[PDB]
Design an enzyme around this catalytic site. Structure first.
Site, PDB file in Angstrom:
ATOM      1  N   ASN A  46       0.714  -0.933  -0.039  1.00 33.94           N
ATOM      2  CA  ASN A  46      -0.149   0.041  -0.026  1.00 33.94           C
ATOM      3  C   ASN A  46       0.954   1.155   0.147  1.00 33.94           C
ATOM      4  O   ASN A  46       1.863   1.268   0.449  1.00 33.94           O
ATOM      5  CB  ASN A  46      -0.842  -0.066   1.205  1.00 33.94           C
ATOM      6  CG  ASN A  46      -1.857  -1.287   1.282  1.00 33.94           C
ATOM      7  OD1 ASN A  46      -2.072  -1.987   2.277  1.00 33.94           O
ATOM      8  ND2 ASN A  46      -2.271  -1.557   0.246  1.00 33.94           N
ATOM      9  N   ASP A  48       1.049   3.799   2.032  1.00 32.26           N
ATOM     10  CA  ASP A  48       1.241   4.130   3.389  1.00 32.26           C
ATOM     11  C   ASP A  48       2.483   3.191   3.836  1.00 32.26           C
ATOM     12  O   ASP A  48       3.026   3.603   4.974  1.00 32.26           O
ATOM     13  CB  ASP A  48      -0.085   4.129   4.187  1.00 32.26           C
ATOM     14  CG  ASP A  48      -0.515   2.687   4.649  1.00 32.26           C
ATOM     15  OD1 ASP A  48       0.000   1.751   3.893  1.00 32.26           O
ATOM     16  OD2 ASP A  48      -1.235   2.792   5.446  1.00 32.26           O
TER      17      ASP A  48
END
Ligand SMILES: [Cl-]
Ligand SMILES: [Cl-]
Ligand SMILES: [Cl-]
Ligand SMILES: [Cl-]
Ligand SMILES: [Cl-]
Ligand code: NA
Length: 129
Positions: A46, A48
């Site tokens: 992801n 993040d």
């Protein structure tokens, strides 16, 4: 392991996911199809920096420990590697905790976008269950 559709439905039922928190088995099979294409070894990073693991793409930000997601929690108390096993027990147990967290299966973005409100029973149709 890449499960077949009916094979995964059977395993999920054996591990008590059928109608868990009110979600019929076709919801779980549909979510697995679009999260992982039924592949237990699926991993996806992801933006993040967290990573999603396994047949239901469980995320390291909250649910498992992968050693490389700063500030994250490990609420299922397992290494994220356990989520990549050919045996789905760890994934199922963790998914039970996730779907109990308040927002039901909306925790799974692919379920909300590709399964919710659709004919999910199609995913189990034909299977000897
Ligand atoms: Cl399929
Ligand atoms: Cl169903
Ligand atoms: Cl970490
Ligand atoms: Cl660990
Ligand atoms: Cl719900
Ligand atoms: Na974590």
């Amino acid at each position: 392991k890449v499960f077949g559709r009916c094979e995964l439905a059977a395993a999920m039922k054996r591990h008590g996911l059928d109608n868990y928190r009110g979600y019929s088995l076709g919801n779980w099979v549909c979510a697995a199809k679009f999260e992982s294409n039924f592949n237990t070894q699926a991993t996806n990073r992801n933006t993040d920096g967290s990573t999603d693991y396994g047949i239901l793409q469980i995320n390291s930000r909250w649910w498992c420990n992968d050693g490389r997601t700063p500030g994250s929690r490990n609420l299922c108390n397992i290494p994220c590697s356990a989520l990549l096993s050919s045996d789905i027990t760890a994934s199922v147990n963790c998914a039970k905790k996730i779907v109990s967290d308040g927002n039901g299966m909306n925790a799974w973005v692919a379920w909300r976008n590709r399964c919710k409100g659709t004919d999910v029973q199609a995913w189990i149709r034909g299977c000897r269950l």
